[PDB]
Amino acid sequence: IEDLMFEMSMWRCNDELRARADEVHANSRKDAAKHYIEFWKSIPTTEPYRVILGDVRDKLYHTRERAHQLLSNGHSDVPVEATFINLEQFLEPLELCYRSLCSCGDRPIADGSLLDFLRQVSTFGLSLVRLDIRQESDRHTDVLDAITTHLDIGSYREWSEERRQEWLLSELSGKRPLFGSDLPKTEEIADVLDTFHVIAELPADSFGAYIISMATAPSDVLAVELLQRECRVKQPLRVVPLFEKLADLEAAPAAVARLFSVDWYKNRINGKQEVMIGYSDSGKDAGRLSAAWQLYKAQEELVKVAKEYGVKLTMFHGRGGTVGR
Amino acid sequence: IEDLMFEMSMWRCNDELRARADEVHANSRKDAAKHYIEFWKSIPTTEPYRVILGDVRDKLYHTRERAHQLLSNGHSDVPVEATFINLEQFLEPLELCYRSLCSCGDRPIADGSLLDFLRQVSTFGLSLVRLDIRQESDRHTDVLDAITTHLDIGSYREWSEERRQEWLLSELSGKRPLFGSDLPKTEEIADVLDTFHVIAELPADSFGAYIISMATAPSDVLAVELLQRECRVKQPLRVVPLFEKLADLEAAPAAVARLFSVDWYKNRINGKQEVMIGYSDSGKDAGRLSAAWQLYKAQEELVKVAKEYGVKLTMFHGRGGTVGR
């Protein structure tokens, strides 16, 4: 950002960027500002891009300081309002500078360092990569089983698929909390629940998708949705099944179609669904040729199902480095 | 405490108090300790009572500092382990000094300032008075009605007494949480729920009894027990009905007997039950003679009921200053 401030030395802007830069220059904080090396004096309105990008620099300095303290120590005194909390609170000022340069005839300048910076923001965001979470279904089933046993309503494990779907749906549409603080948990159970609490405590744009290993039925997906909402995940991330064993790939389209048949899930999914297709274990229990062919068929019929339900399907290919995987 | 330290200048003690004094003198913190005016030097083991009572002074200093910060601000950095948290964590050292003085032939000395201090501790505790909470039954009913409506299971107000009892018992014996963060509350509803949260945040020995105004049935008591358990009141305070109007005194023994009839409640009540008997409003709607006589009859038949259930009844007389109340 400091070099970007150095470049944007123009004086022509719109009425818009003029008004915004004047806004920043009003609350300019006439101070020493000696924590920066360059531009420690209050930036004059003669160069408005430097005003706006100077504010961008302030919020970047405080975002970095907050992330550094949050990482090093378990807490931070930095005010959240002093940082960039939104993915495009960051983008807004830079977008404005772009509109200004283009409007005043300076589009070549805008399509330079400012454009590179824009694409870097809109590609890497506030956390370079969105993190995926993966977990095997049996662990979720263990959790739910502890929940139903502690609630004295039965044992989720012994329950048939139908029962799982009905119960999970009633709990998802219900408004009453499920488990409590006094739930008897195992180290595994506490592991998965604590992962959901960590997901809840952290910003939403730092996460990607929750991938379920050894997924076979809609009950596993609805299980992850229920566990997410119940651990108070403010913005729950999308759930995605992982079909890796040949048996799971042969029957995957049927299962995904049954999942789309649940109207509550099709109405929360918002026309977008992602499903993962593993390549490692497919050619391990069966032949390499048989695995490849079944993978092709699987992709084809998954797209067929998604078209049948009007859902935009994005497929997640778990490809390896070696041809064997 | 500092004057008590000055008096206890004996050098004879038991082996018990000797060993304890050596313990305190081991972790004696050889420091300047200049925050006190007197006894800022590490107290020598020659006067063991001064060692022990000096430690008492440290924990009292940090208990006072903690309470002062908790009140003044809203939190305290004072470690709880540095204070007196128990009603008789305080009592232990003083009881020890007493046993020691008595063993060494100094019972007269022990029955002096040390005995006064003992009685003051065991009478006023860490908070001079135990606080009662009182609230009218209709407000608890409003809360529960909001909870059952928000849970879409009916309306607690419209429910008969029987149904209220069965539901409340099922929730009290159940282990699943009731309402949640998203329960629609009124300013009154939030008032009562927030009082239970305040009770939950504060020490148990700072509270007394929860008195229910206009109490008529076991459901009124069980309602408060449930709200206590559900607002995470770690040590719930005893629930006590208040019969003040002549109609309520006429029917108080029947209601208390009906409450003792619920075995679930009698087995938690631990053989002790308190019920309040107001005196103001009785002689206001009916005669003074009639009210007095009905009060007498009420006390008599309540004792009969409690004796019949093997419950130690302690009656709370809401007497006024004027004979009219």
UniProtKB/Swiss-Prot annotation, chains A, B:
Active site: K284
Transmembrane segments: none
Induction: Upon inorganic phosphate (Pi) deprivation.
Tissue-specific expression: Expressed in all plant organs, with higher levels in roots.
Intracellular or extracellular location(s): Cytoplasm
N-terminal signal peptide: none
PTM (free text): Enhanced activity by phosphorylation at pH 7.3 by lowering Km and sensitivity to inhibition by L-malate and L-aspartate, while enhancing activation by glucose 6-phosphate.
Subunit field text: Homotetramer.
Function: Through the carboxylation of phosphoenolpyruvate (PEP) it forms oxaloacetate, a four-carbon dicarboxylic acid source for the tricarboxylic acid cycle. Contributes probably to the adaptation to inorganic phosphate (Pi) deprivation.
Entry similarity comment: Belongs to the PEPCase type 1 family.
Protein name: Phosphoenolpyruvate carboxylase 1
